[PDB]
Design a binder for this molecule. Structure first.
Ligand SMILES: [Cl-]
Ligand SMILES: [Cl-]
Ligand SMILES: [Cl-]
Length: 118
């Protein structure tokens, strides 16, 4: 679920989910071209992860509630038997950690309409 992803982000990192709304070519809705940096790669993977979650029965990325715990900065996915939840918590956990470890190039906010996302 998207609110759980929002919370994972600020669990694992200093930057909240709003930092990422407008970043690079892939962070936020949609995406085209080459991911510009490490962080843009994080979003590119996550983007594809959510897309691959539709291939699991009864699985929607935005609405699917899973089980996780946050021991700041640590995220733990609790689900084993529920494959959709297990998969989805993983997409989200992977990205929250990816976002936290990746450098934030302020130079790469607001570029989606430039020649770099081409
Ligand atoms: Cl999309
Ligand atoms: Cl498939
Ligand atoms: Cl379905």
């Amino acid at each position: 679920n998207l609110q759980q992803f929002k919370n994972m982000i600020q669990c694992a990192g200093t930057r909240t989910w709003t930092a990422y709304i407008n970043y690079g070519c892939y962070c936020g809705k949609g995406g085209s071209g080459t991911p510009v940096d490490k962080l843009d790669r994080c979003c590119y993977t996550h983007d594809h992860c959510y897309n691959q979650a539709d291939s699991i029965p009864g699985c929607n990325p935005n609405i699917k509630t899973y089980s996780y715990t946050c021991t700041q900065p640590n995220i733990t996915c609790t689900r084993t038997a529920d494959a959709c939840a297990k998969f989805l918590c993983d997409c989200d956990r992977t990205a929250a950690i990816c976002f936290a470890s990746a450098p934030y190039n302020i130079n790469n906010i607001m570029i989606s309409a430039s020649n770099s996302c081409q």
